Design a protein around this ligand. Structure first.
Ligand SMILES: CC(C)[N@+]1(C)[C@@H]2CC[C@H]1C[C@@H](OC(=O)[C@@H](CO)c1ccccc1)C2
Ligand SMILES: CC(C)[N@+]1(C)[C@@H]2CC[C@H]1C[C@@H](OC(=O)[C@@H](CO)c1ccccc1)C2
Ligand SMILES: CC(C)[N@+]1(C)[C@@H]2CC[C@H]1C[C@@H](OC(=O)[C@@H](CO)c1ccccc1)C2
Ligand SMILES: C[N+](C)(C)CCO
Ligand SMILES: C[N+](C)(C)CCO
Ligand SMILES: C[N+](C)(C)CCO
Ligand SMILES: C[N+](C)(C)CCO
Ligand SMILES: C[N+](C)(C)CCO
Ligand SMILES: C[N+](C)(C)CCO
Length: 311
């Protein structure tokens, strides 16, 4: 809603001058939106800026005070004429790189030979987070790359690929909130259910979040690394108890013979039994290793070839 001034070309830059002053920051002029930075140089192309609309970085001129405000920064796209692209859905645009962002009108720079589909929110900023398209979920980076004492916002809004953690993010990551892991394939499609990645199995369920710990899937129990999510197999000591997982990863219950040795996995919980235990009337004795005692004596007690306590 800025009127009364005029655009001016000087020193290879463009400004908007009203009553002798240069427009700074965000301005809505004659049906279009522009951004003039801190000193008035109209911007063009890709820009990572403080969000507009609060009034703290809007309708301002360089002769006015720039009160201190804390505003999140987001990616916006401006035409070569400086007009903000007021997209709220999506649009194919030159990819943003280290060579075509933060430029101002008058500067010379190359146009990305590569175009990409960028998604936008209802306030014309590049969208981040989850998006659903043509039957699949895609994740647009909420964060840029951290270096130690360094941050690059370029990845924000780009389609994520591979292992990706979904943090709660605003200006910074919210460490108190949960951050599930997801896996996006080569085209960015979010994987669901069982998937073998880098030689190991992971379970992403229906929501796509990587499962950890014990997980009940289609009538069977599986154990995924409590931290890394990879499916375990074979004998596993969990919670001070032994469990046997088949090569398929499914937990075994009942009698199980490993080589010549029998073991008994608790009917429901699946934990390996030790000591004397009864099964369908019969009594059996398992050593501390869980191995069933057979054709021998156990503290004055005889047990036959099936480990059954002989009367
Ligand atoms: C390259 C930009 C900064 N312009 C110099 C172009 C397009 C906007 C600005 C000034 C001029 O265009 C306008 O004055 C009209 C065009 O509709 C306009 C200005 C600002 C917002 C919306 C429209 C020519
Ligand atoms: C906790 C899960 C989601 N990981 C972070 C663990 C195990 C899988 C995932 C990523 C990583 O596992 C990997 O195999 C590493 C090896 O460099 C990896 C990271 C990103 C892409 C491919 C492999 C560490
Ligand atoms: C004759 C068998 C079936 N017992 C009754 C004997 C030997 C095993 C079984 C129970 C008991 O032997 C035990 O070791 C005791 C020890 O508390 C036991 C009782 C209940 C379950 C498991 C062991 C006495
Ligand atoms: C959804 N896209 C932008 C991510 C990829 C093309 O299928
Ligand atoms: C993939 N998501 C949209 C489904 C779920 C994360 O909240
Ligand atoms: C975990 N699965 C993919 C490996 C096997 C189901 O039987
Ligand atoms: C495998 N268990 C320990 C997880 C569950 C049985 O109810
Ligand atoms: C894991 N153990 C103690 C259970 C069995 C021998 O392999
Ligand atoms: C150990 N067994 C003989 C007892 C039972 C499995 O069939």
């Amino acid at each position: 809603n800025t009127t009364g001034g005029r655009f001016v070309d000087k020193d290879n830059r463009k400004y908007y001058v009203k009553d002798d002053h240069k427009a700074i920051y965000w301005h809505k002029i004659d049906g279009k939106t522009y951004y003039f930075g801190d000193i008035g140089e109209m911007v063009v192309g890709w820009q990572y800026l403080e969000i507009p609309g609060t009034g703290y970085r809007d309708n301002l001129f360089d002769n006015q005070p720039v009160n201190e405000i804390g505003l999140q920064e987001k990616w916006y796209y401006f035409g070569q004429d400086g007009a903000l692209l007021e997209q709220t859905d999506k649009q194919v645009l030159e990819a943003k790189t280290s060579e075509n962002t933060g430029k101002v009108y008058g500067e010379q720079y190359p146009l990305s030979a590569e175009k990409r589909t960028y998604y936008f929110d209802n306030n014309y900023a590049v969208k981040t987070g989850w998006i659903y398209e043509d039957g699949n979920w895609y994740y647009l980076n909420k964060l840029g790359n951290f270096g130690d004492d360094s941050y690059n916002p370029l990845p924000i809004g780009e389609v994520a690929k591979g292992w990706t953690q979904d943090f709660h993010v605003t200006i910074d990551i919210d460490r108190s909130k949960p951050a599930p892991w997801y896996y996006l394939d080569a085209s960015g499609k979010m994987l669901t259910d069982w998937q073998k990645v880098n030689g190991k199995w992971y379970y992403f369920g229906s929501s796509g979040s990587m499962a950890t710990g014990w997980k009940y899937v289609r009538g069977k129990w599986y154990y995924l690394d409590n931290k890394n999510g990879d499916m375990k197999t074979g004998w596993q000591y969990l919670g001070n108890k032994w469990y046997y997982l088949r090569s398929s990863g499914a937990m075994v219950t009942g009698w199980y013979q490993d080589g010549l040795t029998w073991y008994y996995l608790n009917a429901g919980n699946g934990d390996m039994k030790t000591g004397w235990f009864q099964v369908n009337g019969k009594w059996y004795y398992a050593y501390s290793s869980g191995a069933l005692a057979v054709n021998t004596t156990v503290d004055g007690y005889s047990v036959n070839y099936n480990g059954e306590w002989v009367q």
